[PDB]
């Protein structure tokens, strides 16, 4: 499922 990359992609979605 979610890896560090996917979590990081979220950071640029909410910001």
């Amino acid at each position, epitope marked *: 499922g979610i*890896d*560090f*990359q996917d*979590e*990081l*992609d*979220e*950071f*640029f979605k909410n*910001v």
Partner: antibody
Amino acid sequence: LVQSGAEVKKPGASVKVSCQASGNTFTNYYVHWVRQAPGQGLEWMGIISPSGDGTRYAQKFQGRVTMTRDTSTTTVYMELSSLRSEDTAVYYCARGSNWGPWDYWGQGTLVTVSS
Amino acid sequence: IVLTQSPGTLSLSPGERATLSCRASQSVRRNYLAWYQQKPGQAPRLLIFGASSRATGIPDRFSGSGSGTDFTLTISRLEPEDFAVYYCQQYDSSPPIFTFGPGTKVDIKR
């Protein structure tokens, strides 16, 4: 990960280092910029997004750094302003893996600041 | 967010075991700590990621384990190709942190 050559800037000036790569190994992956002072450790500076300039800079280099990506030439650029003696170091560009740590680094670019 | 490495210089002979420790100030999320090896004149090369997962091309002699604030990198048998400087790095996703340790140099005992 081929990078730019040695750069001899002056104190208080700015430097722009390049990191050209293959889009197969970079268009779908994140890139990071690190520096190593002569004889010291590694210092993370920022992260460039897989496409746009979704950069997250470091506090020590906040306001004096600017990272950009060019999808036409598949290159990543780093610009540092207000150069000082403490900024003389070899800068590296590394691609982030799906898990976080950087797997493929670059040759490095020595950024000397003097007369 | 601040990583400390002990020792600063590991004087060991080839064939021996090596233990490098990395103490953090806080807990690393998802045990997101990686160990790197940097050879003189070369760029750093990833050795272990996730505190205990090995990367591609890394030998089984290099073994990693850690949790929270205490992490360790072990080498079963030291070979001449393993003598270099090792670094530990903490990585986070929100917000991206990416902090390194001071650095431990493993040299040939004499």
